Amino acid sequence: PPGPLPEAVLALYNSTRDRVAKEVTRVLMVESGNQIYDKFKGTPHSLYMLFNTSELREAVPEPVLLSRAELRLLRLKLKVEQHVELYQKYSNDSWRYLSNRLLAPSDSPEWLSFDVTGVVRQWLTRREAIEGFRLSAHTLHVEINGFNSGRRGDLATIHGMNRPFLLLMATPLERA
């Protein structure tokens, strides 16, 4: 059935050019009302991002197939400034510094990206079910898209659109 594109394909095409011989897939974060706040909670200084490792493996099943991975977040209007840091999860219960950012006083929503290739590759190798990232203020007054459960009604479902995700690039098995 050629002609029109499905949402998943068009959305990916645009996603690969939103931030300013390989296949690309996306793994989206788990719903905050489903898992993010069940392992702990959101706090007024930090935010958590969890991902389903099994779902990731379905796209990129091997630690030697992955070529690149980026963590994509949609930052909402900031107005003035925010200094934040990003941490990786270790031993399933500890966090360590990975990278950081100075956030500009944007007027509009903007996509940010982090290079997490090594992180995903390690999590891909680890025989774990839940993987994730932690962000915190260097006290945290920057909002990002999603991370709420009080939104229902007609817009209940679109709430999960443009939520943070891992953009994964990998070598085709056919090419090896």
Binding site: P1, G3, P4, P6, E7, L74, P109, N145, R152, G153, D154, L155, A156, T157, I158, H159, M161, N162
Partner: protein, 359 residues
């Protein structure tokens, strides 16, 4: 006191006698047999009225394949199949939508989505023989949104039903209004919350193919909705994806000439649903009488193919082509003080009875 059946050539193909003339006296009665013979290979006008509120964003793309595939399936049920298209969301007023200046024309703005400004009802494509045009109209359709769960379904339906000159409904066709949704619709008095206290007059209010009284008139009642749907000979198919399917199902007893079914979670049955609904609607025959004649009482009994009898508009089921259904009509005069119309619901032919009387 008598009953006269014209010996003139009938101008009806399905419902005969087309006209009946009777004479009554108070305390007297007369009767006649009304015959209905459903046809095979009807011309069919199918208009898609689609809910394009945010909750439908996962379903709009599923209509990208209900053009050519449906046309093929209908080839064995119809003679001339035309497709039309339009859409609805809600009343563009507080509290149903946000009125904040930066999102009023983009209710999805907070999620950084490019949504279509909210609207009541928009006509997109007139009924046409060109299937490609239908598919194009669907493919370029954007998704909108609003705040409250219920949608302005009944309001859009009425306009779709009454605005014949804009939709392009044919008299010589089976008129099918297909409504696609997920949640329930707003009721006539729900609009009081928005400050709308003016009853829907049931008229056609499209300007540039857009309904422009959506913010000044309230939602239609079920009474008004069924009245206009029957008057315009429109059969209604409700295609509902959510659990609210049952809500629509249970309104069917209140809305004669209406059928409802369920859309699968993968929308794999959109074309099958339309075809089954059509085939089921054509197998149900029932009549109602519009009696504006004072002092006259009508009593109609249906005589079904299996010999069973069903009173009033209860109707006969499992009627096929080459299968006649009879209705035994008794007319009695009770008091001294025009004509009445007896018509099958969903048919484009009626029987008009004139009543002469003396005392």
């Amino acid at each position: 006191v008598h009953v006269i059946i014209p010996t003139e050539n009938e101008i009806n193909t399905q419902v005969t006698p087309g006209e009946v003339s009777i004479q009554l006296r108070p305390g007297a009665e007369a009767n006649f047999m009304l015959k209905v013979h459903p046809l095979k290979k009807y011309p069919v006008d199918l208009y898609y009225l689609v809910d394009v509120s945010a909750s439908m964003h996962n379903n709009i793309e599923k209509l990208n394949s209900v053009g050519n595939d449906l046309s093929r399936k209908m080839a064995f049920f119809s003679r001339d199949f035309r497709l039309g298209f339009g859409s609805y969301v809600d009343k563009t007023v507080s509290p149903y939508i946000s009125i904040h200046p930066e999102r009023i024309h983009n209710q999805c703005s907070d999620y950084n989505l490019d949504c279509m400004p909210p609207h009541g009802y928009i006509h997109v494509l007139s009924l046409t023989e060109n299937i490609t045009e239908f598919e194009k109209a669907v493919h370029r359709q954007k998704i909108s949104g609003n705040i409250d769960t219920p949608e302005g379904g009944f309001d859009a339906m009425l306009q779709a039903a009454v605005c014949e000159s804009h939709i392009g409904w044919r008299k010589e066709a089976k008129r099918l209004l297909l409504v696609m949704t997920d949640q329930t619709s707003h009721l006539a008095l729900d609009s009081k919350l928005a400050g709308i206290v003016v009853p829907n007059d049931g008229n056609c209010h499209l300007k540039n193919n857009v309904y422009v009284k959506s913010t000044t008139m309230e939602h239609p009642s079920l009474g008004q909705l069924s009245e206009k749907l029957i008057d315009n000979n429109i059969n209604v198919i409700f295609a509902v994806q959510g659990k609210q399917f049952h809500w629509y199902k249970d309104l069917l007893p209140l809305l004669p000439g209406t059928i409802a079914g369920e859309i699968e979670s993968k929308a794999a049955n959109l074309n099958n649903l339309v075809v089954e609904a059509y085939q089921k609607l054509i197998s149900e025959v029932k009549v109602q009488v519009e009696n504006q004649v004072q002092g006259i009482y009508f009593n109609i009994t249906a005589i079904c193919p299996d010999g069973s009898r069903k009173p009033g508009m209860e109707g006969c089921r499992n009627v096929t082509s080459n299968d006649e259904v009879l209705f035994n009509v008794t007319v009695t005069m009770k008091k001294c003080d025009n004509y009445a119309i007896i018509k099958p619901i969903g048919f484009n032919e009626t029987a008009k009875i004139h009543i002469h009387r003396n005392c």
